[PDB]
């Protein structure tokens, strides 16, 4: 496949409707070899048996939260993974109470905080980790929301931490180019799932979505699995700093109605 | 390839520095059928020897300032693909006292409107042409420039044609969507040639480029190749509407000297 | 008045509704001077009656449509006004059967050549004409649509001839700034009028508006107007190549329902 | 003047070319009641000064780093304007080792928190604090940077935090909008100044800047003063969630060398 050779690390497996399942599935089905971390221990096996079936054994603790834990990963990455070609960074959080309702009310000094720290800065402090292991030619990416360009009910301040993150991308491309690293980000559409979300109110959005979106339906994680595969492939030797929309044209339509 | 199974157009095919040319090996090489065509008889024996390369026999004129032109060319085509996933317009023009100094001096509404004419509206006038005999999962790709985003010197109003471009790129995805069509741009980055442009001080524009684009270099028609047979397979099936950058991050930096 | 002293030139009064009436209004109020021109004779009566009401006695014709027209309303404009400060371009038009219905199908060649021609290089055609006129200082303001930037429905070609003028403008303030003169455009939001419009489904449109825009209305030509001199004036002297939003915060919110 | 009969409260002032000082003459300049908070003791009798030269003795001292802080400040400033009309935020702050160097290598976690805490969080803080104390028709703003939109050598991790700030008045928008609260922010340019800046090699940004804006010089805080006042005035009414680019159009040109 277009990925053969390459090595990458993929982040955020948490079950498989996690959108980096779907990146996983992708890349190895284009003949990548991966890596897989987690979170904690309440995840380890569910990971660990998702890379078995990926043909993975290197399934790693990684809590983003937590410098040492980025640098101990990236330690015993090390020991099988020398060099690699990139990671996937598909990891993002913030406490419950602060996406519901009114923006203003429900921001917190704290919670502003944290949903900054893990899901913008830990993009960079992963790469901050792991940079003197990239190959030329790597590839970094990320996963945002359209939430950051527009300010979406309920989302509130994951809208803030994505726009930094989106920031993130654009710093970090102009900084790593010169080494032979690219950075992009997928600002991917809602996708439509059983579970249950943070953002209140997402099976309305899901709903509305697909009536309104130019190709009227949602897009699933194989779509977003295949851009991001294209994304970090040689086939995007000419793509950097980038934040691609994989939302079937929701965001340049409107008053479709 | 991820290609395989698909009849695709091409346009703007003139040489082997053509971007075109570029898309349609990219393409080839991912198992697309090909199908050329070329605006008169100058063109002609070059782009149907470039055809034979890759393995096609499908090569029509088309000149996209007459309608019957395209109208003859689809009913042509027709006749050997009743039906076809879409098309590539690399098509472009503007009278050369244009894209010459300042552009309110230069501009004129006659220039205007061939730039227009030519450069943006032929992309629809194509689709309506075709638009009976378009598969469901098709998808349409255009070229377009920076230029359409910021004012820059000399491009004068190629830019304004541009723009126009992308806005068409937006208004057809909505119109197509929900039957199946896709529709994207890609915006690329100037390419180091050896020919003469009708932009002045080109070769600058280049050097400039190079020094301050991120990969610290220019993109080549292998890399915009390589992006649009993405683009135009059904691994983008949640992109459309979209302006992909294609041009190693040079929008996204500033002031890096 | 922060208008005083300004010799200001406006473009496109056809009714006391009439955003350009707005914009003469206020800049009356904030002390300038002005003049205006109308488009046909049968305009001529009504303008010249607001123009009286604004304490002016300086109304010509000028079809956009034809280059000897602006001449010649230029030739004629500086035997009272041999130096201004700025013109305000208030005017499109496209014909009717292109706003209903499916762009690709409405759309036709000469419907887009018209449309571009009228809504957007009749804007750089004016600038061209009067350029040796211009005091240091001068500012030429025109009026977009949140169209040119989203796919709306009906709204059609229109869309494609202002993301041309929006193009436009960056271009104009690009190539004049140097010689002291300023160029901008205000994207307004759909005005809640009684009269008929020659947008499909407007009411809806603006239905719909006030309950998603933040502020929770719809703009008046008063704001308009207000925002229209601000951008005249010397106020906004750093201000030049914008396109200010001036629509409430509505292309700024998603899914507010 | 058109600020008559507001009470503004202004942030950040902290010398005679600082930009809060340029934003309060042009305020009260057109009839604005104003009010100043202090960072801290050093900055008490400076502060105290300007004010008395802008009539006024409302001088309170503000860290927006604590919470209570913000909700002293609010307390003691309701003693004398129980109700008032927007405050401006002209805040921010990063540690300086920060600002030199490679982005990837400079960052770090505290880092990335403090930038975005103060030149962030703090604006929604405040916000927060008095926005009961806020009467309809109220406008905040606050001052951001091209860096939130580009990658710009240096501003590193501050690049980030306007990017979240930017996102903030976008959310702040459009949950206030409804109760008569307008939010917007000006993306000021380079202010040409003697002092010496936290930001690195400054001075080169200023040089380049002249050359390539459209304007041909950088803007002044009296430019950016006045777009100031007037987006805090009923004249903006029909503006909010916007970032207002002050920076002589160079943001929208291009390769002008
Ligand atoms: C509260 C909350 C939480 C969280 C969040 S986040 O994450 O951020 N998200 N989510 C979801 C969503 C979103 C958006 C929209 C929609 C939805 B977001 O905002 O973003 C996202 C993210 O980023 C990614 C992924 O996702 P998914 O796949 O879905 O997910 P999950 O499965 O859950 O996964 C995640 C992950 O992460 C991790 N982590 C955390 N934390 C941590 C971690 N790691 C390490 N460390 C630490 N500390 C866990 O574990 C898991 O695995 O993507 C995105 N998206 C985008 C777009 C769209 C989407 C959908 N879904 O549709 C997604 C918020 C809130
Ligand atoms: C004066 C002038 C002319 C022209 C023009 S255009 O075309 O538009 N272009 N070119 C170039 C350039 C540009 C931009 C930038 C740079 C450069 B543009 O603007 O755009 C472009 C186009 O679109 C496309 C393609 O290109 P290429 O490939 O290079 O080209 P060629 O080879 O030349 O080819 C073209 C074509 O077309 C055709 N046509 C014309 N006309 C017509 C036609 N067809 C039909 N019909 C008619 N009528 C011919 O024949 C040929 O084949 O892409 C683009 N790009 C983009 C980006 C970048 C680039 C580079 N190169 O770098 C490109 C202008 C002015
Ligand atoms: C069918 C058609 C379509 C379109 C047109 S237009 O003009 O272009 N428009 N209209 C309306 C509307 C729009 C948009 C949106 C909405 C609505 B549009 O597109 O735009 C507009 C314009 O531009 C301006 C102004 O308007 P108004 O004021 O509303 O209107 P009127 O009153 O009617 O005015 C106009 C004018 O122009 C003129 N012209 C024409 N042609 C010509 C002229 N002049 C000279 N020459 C020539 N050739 C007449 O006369 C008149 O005065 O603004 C805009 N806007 C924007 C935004 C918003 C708005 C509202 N309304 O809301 C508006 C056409 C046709
Ligand atoms: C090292 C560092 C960095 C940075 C900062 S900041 O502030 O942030 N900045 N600065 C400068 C600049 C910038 C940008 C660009 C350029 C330059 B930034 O980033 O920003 C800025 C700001 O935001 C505003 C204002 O500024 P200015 O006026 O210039 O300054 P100053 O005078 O110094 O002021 C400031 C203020 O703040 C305050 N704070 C702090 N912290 C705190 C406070 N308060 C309270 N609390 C706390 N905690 C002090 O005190 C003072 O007063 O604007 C901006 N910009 C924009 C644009 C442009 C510009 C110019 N300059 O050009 C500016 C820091 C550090």
Redesign the pocket.
Same mark, same amino acid.
């Given at each position: 496949g277009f990925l053969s050779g390459k090595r990458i690390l993929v982040?955020?497996?948490?079950?498989k #409707? &996690?959108?980096?399942y779907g990146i996983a599935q992708a890349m190895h089905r284009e003949g990548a070899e991966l890596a897989f971390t987690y979170?904690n221990d309440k995840?380890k096996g569910r990971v660990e048996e998702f890379a078995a079936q990926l043909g993975s054994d290197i399934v790693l603790q990684?809590?983003?939260?937590e410098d040492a834990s980025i640098d101990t990963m990236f330690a015993e990455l090390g020991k099988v993974w020398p060099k690699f070609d990139g990671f996937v960074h598909?990891?993002?959080?913030?406490?419950?109470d602060?996406?519901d309702g009114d923006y203003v009310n429900a921001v917190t000094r704290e919670g502003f905080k944290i949903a900054h720290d893990?899901?913008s800065y830990?993009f960079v402090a992963m790469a901050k980790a792991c940079r003197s292991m990239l190959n030329p030619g790597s590839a970094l990416l990320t #996963? &945002?929301?359209l939430?950051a360009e527009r300010a979406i009910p309920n989302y509130n301040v994951?809208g803030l931490a994505?726009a930094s993150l989106e920031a993130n991308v654009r710093y970090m491309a102009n900084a790593m180019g010169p080494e032979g690293v690219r950075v992009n980000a997928i600002?991917?559409?809602?996708?439509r799932?059983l579970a249950a979300?943070?953002?209140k109110d997402?099976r309305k959005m899901l709903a509305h979505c697909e009536a309104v979106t130019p190709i009227r339906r949602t897009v699933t994680i194989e779509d977003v699995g295949n851009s991001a595969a294209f994304l970090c492939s040689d086939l995007s030797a000419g793509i950097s700093g980038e934040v691609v929309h994989v939302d079937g044209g929701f965001s340049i339509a409107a008053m479709n109605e």
């Open positions: 982040t955020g497996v948490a079950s #409707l &996690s959108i980096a979170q995840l990684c809590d983003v939260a598909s990891i993002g959080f913030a406490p419950g602060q996406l893990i899901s830990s #996963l &945002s929301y939430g994951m994505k600002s991917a559409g809602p996708i799932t979300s943070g953002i997402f």
